[PDB]
Amino acid sequence: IEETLVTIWQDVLGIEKIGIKDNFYALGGDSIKAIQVAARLHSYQLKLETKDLLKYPTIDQLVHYIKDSKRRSEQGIVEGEIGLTPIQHWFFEQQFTNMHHWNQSYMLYRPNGFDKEILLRVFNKIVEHHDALRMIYKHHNGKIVQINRGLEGTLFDFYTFDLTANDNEQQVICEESARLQNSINLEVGPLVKIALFHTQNGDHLFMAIHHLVVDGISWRILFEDLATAYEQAMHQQTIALPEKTDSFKDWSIELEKYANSELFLEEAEYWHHLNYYTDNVQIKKDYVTMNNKQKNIRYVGMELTIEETEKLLKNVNKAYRTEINDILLTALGFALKEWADIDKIVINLEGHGREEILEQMNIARTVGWFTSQYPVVLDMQKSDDLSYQIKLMKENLRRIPNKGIGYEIFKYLTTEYLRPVLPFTLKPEINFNYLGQFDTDVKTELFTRSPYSMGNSLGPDGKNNLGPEGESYFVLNINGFIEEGKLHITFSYNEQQYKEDTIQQLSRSYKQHLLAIIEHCVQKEDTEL
Ligand SMILES: *O=P([O])([O])O[C]C([C])([C])[C]([O])C(=O)[N][C][C]C(=O)[N][C][C][S]
The missing domain is CATH 1.10.1200.10 (ACP-like)
Incomplete structure (x- = not known):
C-alpha cells in the first residue's frame, strides 16, 4: 500500500x-x-x-x-566456514601489526539510564539475530579461515562501571573503553566488546566491534534493533526482531560465484582506463618519513552550518540531477587543483558496497563488512566552468559499472585462470570516505549520542579504534558524515609528512569550493529529462 x-x-x-x-x-x-x-x-x-x-x-x-519478495533468507542459526569477501581480503593482505585491534566503535546516551538486565537480554538477541557478530578467524596452512560460530561460547563481553562517585568521568571512560578496544581475540572471540557506564547525568553505553564483521550501515541496523528489543522488554513484551535478510555466509557464497561468472568477466575491459593514469597517483608531500604508523596520524576538520548542509542535501542535486558523491568529489577536484596544482589524480573511493549485482539476494538488513573501494579518476579541465566540471564528474561516475564494486572482486575473488590482467598494484595516496547521515539512527526516543564520545568513532580517527603501532595506508585520508544536521569533513595525514598549516589550506580550500558549488547549484532549476 x-x-x-x-x-x-x-x-x-x-x-x-x-x-x-x-x-x-x-x-x-x-x-x-x-x-x-x-x-x-x-x-x-x-x-x-x-x-x-x-x-x-x-x-x-x-x-x-x-x-x-520471492527470496526467503536463512532465519535459523548460521554456522560454518565463510570465504573472505574483497574488503576482508584487503584487510588481511595488509598484515597490520596487532590486527586484532582494528575496530569501529560508538557510544549511546540515555539520561534516565539503561536497565542492565534488559541490555543483557537485548544483546543476546542481537548476536543471535545478526550471525556475523559471532565470527572467528583461524590460521590453517598459512591461510585465514573465517568461521561463523553458532550459539556456543562467549558472543560478547559486557562490563558495568559505576562512576557515580568519580569526578573524572571522561578520563575513566577513555581509559576503560580503550582497554576493551585492545582486548579482542580474533581466534576465539568475541569480536563484540560492551561497557555500560553509570554517571550523574545518566548512562553511557559504549560498543567496540572489530571491523571484520561490521560497517556503517550495520551500525544503523544494530541501533534500530537495540531500541526495538529494549522497548519491548521494558513493556514486558517478548523480544522480537524483524525477519533476517540474507546471511553474510550466503552473500559471500554468491559473491564468489559472481566473481567467476561469464557476465561479470566482460566488465574487465572498462577498468583498463586506469592504465592511462598510473603516474597520476602520488601527490606532493612536505616531508619524507619512515614513520608510518597510526600514532603518527593527525587530522584537520571542517564543517558547514545546518543551513549550508540543508542546501547540499535537499536543493543542490536538482541542478544536474546528481547524487552527493558527484558534488563532494567535484569540490575535491577543485580543492586539489588550487592546493597542489594538480590536473589529474586517482583516488580511492569507498562505497557501502551493497549493490544489487547478485540476483534476488537481499542484504539490506545484514550486519557485516560490505564496504567496497575502487580507484576513481578526477580530471580538472575547465577550472572556470562549474557546469562543465560537475557534468564531467557526473558522467565519469556513471561510466563506472555497478558503483565500482567489481574492481576488488576481480582483484581478490576471481580465480587465477579467469582473473583479468588489470593494474592491481595501483595504490592511490588519497582516500575518500563519506559515511552519510546518522541523526535518524542515533537520535531516538530511547537514546541519543553520548557527550562523552570523542570524535568520529566510525572512522580511522576515532579514539582507540586502531592499534597505534599499526601501519597507515593512505597519505590523505578524507572522511565525512552528517551529524546534528551538519556536514563534517576531516583530513587525516601523517604529522611528519605535512605541516598542519599545509593541510589547513587544503581543508579551507575544500570548504570554499564546496560552498561555491552549493550556491551555483541552488540557483539552477530542475530541467533534466
Ligand atoms: O550509492 P550512494 O547511495 O549514493 O552512496 C552513499 C554515499 C553517498 C554515502 C557514499 O559515499 C557511500 O556509499 N559511502 C559508504 C562508506 C562506508 O559505508 N564506510 C563503511 C565503514 S568502513
Whole structure:
C-alpha cells in the first residue's frame, strides 16, 4: 500500500509528514536511505529494487513498482566456514601489526539510564539475530579461515562501571573503553566488546566491534534493533526482531560465484582506463618519513552550518540531477587543483558496497563488512566552468559499472585462470570516505549520542579504534558524515609528512569550493529529462 511507503519514508527520512508527491532526494534521501527503505519493506514481505526509487522518486510513482519478495533468507542459526569477501581480503593482505585491534566503535546516551538486565537480554538477541557478530578467524596452512560460530561460547563481553562517585568521568571512560578496544581475540572471540557506564547525568553505553564483521550501515541496523528489543522488554513484551535478510555466509557464497561468472568477466575491459593514469597517483608531500604508523596520524576538520548542509542535501542535486558523491568529489577536484596544482589524480573511493549485482539476494538488513573501494579518476579541465566540471564528474561516475564494486572482486575473488590482467598494484595516496547521515539512527526516543564520545568513532580517527603501532595506508585520508544536521569533513595525514598549516589550506580550500558549488547549484532549476 502507499500508506506503508509513507510511513517508512517518514521514519527513514526523519520527516514527520510526507505527501505521495514529495521527491525522495529533495527530502534529503541518498542511496543509503534507499537501502533502509528496502530493508523496512523486506519486513513486510515487500520488495524494492533501489534503482526504481531513482527513476520514480515519489511514492505515487513508486507504488506500482513495489513487488512481493520471492527470496526467503536463512532465519535459523548460521554456522560454518565463510570465504573472505574483497574488503576482508584487503584487510588481511595488509598484515597490520596487532590486527586484532582494528575496530569501529560508538557510544549511546540515555539520561534516565539503561536497565542492565534488559541490555543483557537485548544483546543476546542481537548476536543471535545478526550471525556475523559471532565470527572467528583461524590460521590453517598459512591461510585465514573465517568461521561463523553458532550459539556456543562467549558472543560478547559486557562490563558495568559505576562512576557515580568519580569526578573524572571522561578520563575513566577513555581509559576503560580503550582497554576493551585492545582486548579482542580474533581466534576465539568475541569480536563484540560492551561497557555500560553509570554517571550523574545518566548512562553511557559504549560498543567496540572489530571491523571484520561490521560497517556503517550495520551500525544503523544494530541501533534500530537495540531500541526495538529494549522497548519491548521494558513493556514486558517478548523480544522480537524483524525477519533476517540474507546471511553474510550466503552473500559471500554468491559473491564468489559472481566473481567467476561469464557476465561479470566482460566488465574487465572498462577498468583498463586506469592504465592511462598510473603516474597520476602520488601527490606532493612536505616531508619524507619512515614513520608510518597510526600514532603518527593527525587530522584537520571542517564543517558547514545546518543551513549550508540543508542546501547540499535537499536543493543542490536538482541542478544536474546528481547524487552527493558527484558534488563532494567535484569540490575535491577543485580543492586539489588550487592546493597542489594538480590536473589529474586517482583516488580511492569507498562505497557501502551493497549493490544489487547478485540476483534476488537481499542484504539490506545484514550486519557485516560490505564496504567496497575502487580507484576513481578526477580530471580538472575547465577550472572556470562549474557546469562543465560537475557534468564531467557526473558522467565519469556513471561510466563506472555497478558503483565500482567489481574492481576488488576481480582483484581478490576471481580465480587465477579467469582473473583479468588489470593494474592491481595501483595504490592511490588519497582516500575518500563519506559515511552519510546518522541523526535518524542515533537520535531516538530511547537514546541519543553520548557527550562523552570523542570524535568520529566510525572512522580511522576515532579514539582507540586502531592499534597505534599499526601501519597507515593512505597519505590523505578524507572522511565525512552528517551529524546534528551538519556536514563534517576531516583530513587525516601523517604529522611528519605535512605541516598542519599545509593541510589547513587544503581543508579551507575544500570548504570554499564546496560552498561555491552549493550556491551555483541552488540557483539552477530542475530541467533534466
Ligand atoms: O550509492 P550512494 O547511495 O549514493 O552512496 C552513499 C554515499 C553517498 C554515502 C557514499 O559515499 C557511500 O556509499 N559511502 C559508504 C562508506 C562506508 O559505508 N564506510 C563503511 C565503514 S568502513
